[PDB]
Amino acid sequence: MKVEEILEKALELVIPDEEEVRKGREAEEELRRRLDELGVEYVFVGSYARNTWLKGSLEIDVFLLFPEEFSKEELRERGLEIGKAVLDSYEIRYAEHPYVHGVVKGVEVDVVPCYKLKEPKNIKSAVDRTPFHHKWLEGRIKGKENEVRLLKGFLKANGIYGAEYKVRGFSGYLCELLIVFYGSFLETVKNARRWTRRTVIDVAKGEVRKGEEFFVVDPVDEKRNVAANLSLDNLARFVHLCREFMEAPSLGFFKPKHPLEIEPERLRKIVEERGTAVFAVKFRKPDIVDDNLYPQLERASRKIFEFLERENFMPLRSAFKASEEFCYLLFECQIKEISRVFRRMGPQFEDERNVKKFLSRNRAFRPFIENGRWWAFEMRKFTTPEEGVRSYASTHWHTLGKNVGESIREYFEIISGEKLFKEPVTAELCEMMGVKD
RNA sequence: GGCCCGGGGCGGUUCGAUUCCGCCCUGGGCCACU
Ligand SMILES: Nc1ncnc2c1ncn2[C@@H]1O[C@H](COP(=O)(O)OP(=O)(O)OP(=O)(O)O)[C@@H](O)[C@H]1O
Ligand SMILES: [Mg+2]
Prior knowledge:
Elements: H1 3-14, H2 18-36, E1 42-45, H3 46-50, E2 59-66, H4 72-86, E3 89-91, E4 100-104, E5 107-115, H5 130-138, H6 145-157, H7 172-182, H8 185-192, E6 199-202, E7 207-210, E8 215-218, E9 221-225, H9 232-247, H10 264-274, E10 277-284, H11 290-310, E11 315-322, E12 326-333, E13 341-348, H12 352-359, E14 368-370, E15 373-379, H13 385-395, H14 402-410, E16 413-415, H15 417-421, H16 426-433
Parallel strand pairs: 2-5, 6-8
Antiparallel strand pairs: 1-2, 3-4, 4-5, 6-7, 8-9, 10-12, 10-16, 11-12, 13-15, 14-15
Helix pairs in contact: 1-6, 6-7, 7-8, 11-14
The structure holds adenosine-5'-triphosphate and magnesium ion (MG).
Adenosine-5'-triphosphate is lined by residues 45-47, 53-54, 57, 59, 61, 130, 133, 163, 171-173, 226.
The structure holds one RNA strand.
C-alpha cells in the first residue's frame, strides 16, 4: 500500500467507464438538438464540458445566455420556459437564482439562465461568473482531469465535497482551481498538510500568502473567495485527512465510509455509561429548500446551545437531523439536574445606595457578605436542561430562524430516554458522542 | 433564507445595561441554490 499504486487503483473509482461517457455524449447530442430546434443561444459549462465529472455523479450544465438589458424576471420566466420544453421530466426548486432541473436520455441536467456579460466584473445574476470559469479552465485543466476526479472522489468519500450549506465543503470549481495550482492530486494533498486558517491561494498570481482567513481567490474575480463557504472545521478535517493519507495511504480514503447501523440498545448503554442528559427538540420540517433550512437548523441549534451554557447545564455538543417529515435539534449536557438555589453577585459593601437597592428585593433566603461584596441566593424557574429548553423554545421561538422558528411556534416537543432512541437520529447521536466502530 | 457591518426606535432582566435576553424599522456588504 503505497501512494503510487493506491492512486492507480483509485482511478477505477473516480473515472467514468466508456458506457457512462457514451450515455453523457448521447445525452449531450440530444440537448443540442432540442435547443437548436428552439433557436436558443446556449453554452455547455461545468464538470461535463471539461470532463472532470466524478464517476456516478454526472450532471450536464446548460447555460442560457441572455442580453444584459433583460429583467431578472424575464430571465426567470424565459429560462424556466426553455428548460421545461427541453427536459423529459423536470423539477423547479431553488433558493434565489432560478433554473430547471431535469433528465435527458437518463442523465441529470440543469438548465440555467444568466446574463452574457463581458468581464466577470459586476455580476448581475448570481451565476454570471460560471461561463468565465469555463473559459479560464478549459485551456488549463486539459490533461489533468483525472487528477480533478481523484480530488473530488477523496472529498466526497469523506463528506466534505459540496459547497452548499448542507456540506460547507469544497465546490467542484475549487477542486479544479487547486489542481491547476498544484498540478495534481498528490501535490495538492502534500501541500494542504501545511494550510492554516489564514492561508491565501491566488491561482492567477501563482502565489500563496498569509491573510485574514482561508481565501482562494477566483482567477475570474479577485474579490471572490471561491472557498467562502468552506467551514473552518471542514478545512481542518481536510488538512488532517491529508496528513493521515500521506502517512498511511489507503484507497479506503476514496471509499464512502461505513453506513453504520449500531443498535439502539447499544446507544442506551453508552448514554448510561456517560451519565449525561441526551435529548432533542422535535418539530415539523418547513417546506423550504435545503439551502434555506440547514442554516436555520444551525442557528436554532446554536441559540439553544448558548442558552444551555449560560444556564449552567454544561452543554457538551449539539447536532441536528432533518428527515422529510420532521427536524431534530440534538443535545447532550453534563448536568441532568441542578439545584434550585444559586448565587447572584451584588454590589461592594462600599456604596450603600446600591447595597440598599440590592437588599430591598423581596427574597427567600437573606443575602450575605463574602469578600467585600453582597451576594444573594436566588431560585431557578427550572432545574433540568429539558425543562429549560421547553421554556426557552416556547418563548424565544422567533429567534430560532424565520421558518424553523415559526414551525416550533406552532409545535415542538422534547424527546428523551428510550422514546428518543426510536427516532431517526441514532446515527447523529453516535457521531455527536464520538462512539467508535 | 443564513452570516457580517451600520442607523433609529423598544420590551424584559439586573444593585447597576450601550454592554445580558429579546422585539419592531432601516441602510450596506457577503454566502448557499449553477
Ligand atoms: N459554489 C460555487 N462556487 C463557485 N462556482 C460555482 C459554484 N457552484 C457552481 N459554480 C460554477 O458552476 C459550475 C457548475 O457547478 P455544478 O454545481 O454543476 O458542479 P460542477 O462544477 O459541474 O462539478 P460536479 O458536477 O462534478 O459537482 C461550476 O463548474 C462553476 O463554474
Ligand atoms: Mg454538473
